[PDB]
Design a protein around this ligand. Sequence first.
Ligand SMILES: [Cl-]
Lengths: 154, 158
Amino acid sequence: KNIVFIGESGSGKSTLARALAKDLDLVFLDSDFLIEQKFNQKASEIWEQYGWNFALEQEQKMADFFSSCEKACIATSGSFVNVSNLEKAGFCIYLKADFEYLKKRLIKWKKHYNETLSKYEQKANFILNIENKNIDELLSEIKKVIKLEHHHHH
Amino acid sequence: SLAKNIVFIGESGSGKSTLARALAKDLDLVFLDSDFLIEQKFNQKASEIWEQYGWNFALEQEQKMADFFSSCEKACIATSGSFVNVSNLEKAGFCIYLKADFEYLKKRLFPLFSDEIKWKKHYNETLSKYEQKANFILNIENKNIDELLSEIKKVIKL
Ligand SMILES: [Cl-]
């Protein structure tokens, strides 16, 4: 019983998760924030100091942590998609947009983006096309989807 | 055991945030700081929330945070100064009470005589609650972080 936002950098996961957490009265968890608070260091500095393997392990620990808790609204990192069984974090909302759209709101990245699109679509409980929508439109659509979930029945 | 988390409890000034973060790094656990989590949710200092919503809403937010701690696992948790008043706080995990006397905490910082008696009274009362709920009681007075981490690590192992 978590709401879990997944998608690529630039998709607005942090902004949406926070607002929704406040509206639905849930615990707001931001993956990058939690990692940075633990290490007292920016995420990129963590990656550079400890190596990609350590960094990925931290991402996995965050994913496992998300799968353990309840009543949270979670913004996941750009690495979440690659962890083991990421759909177990809760009800997943994929914030979908094309590469050019995401790029403007922020190479190897394109490679990552191309190969990861299918994983997001598979893990999503709900796919939300975010292009050209303001925050209130997005929140409205998400709140409807959550109400539909909690209507069946519960 | 079946304790899911390490939970630091005690008054403000007892060093819960610093020790929980340090231990989280050393034992490779998730670091959760109650006040940080509340502030990132409302984008407001935890104090300003007391003023905008009811004191009852604030206690409700503190209770929801406690529920959350009781739900998760493999975290190292710095609880707030209100945590001791929540219900079923033992469900949060292995509780470590960071103990210090009033005089000491006053150093690690109520302009009126009356306000200080009130504060001391409050302190005295919560003292028995902390020592009640603690799985390990750690006096922090005049001890540096490496000494505190060493004592905690030993206790965890046992
Ligand atoms: Cl503190």
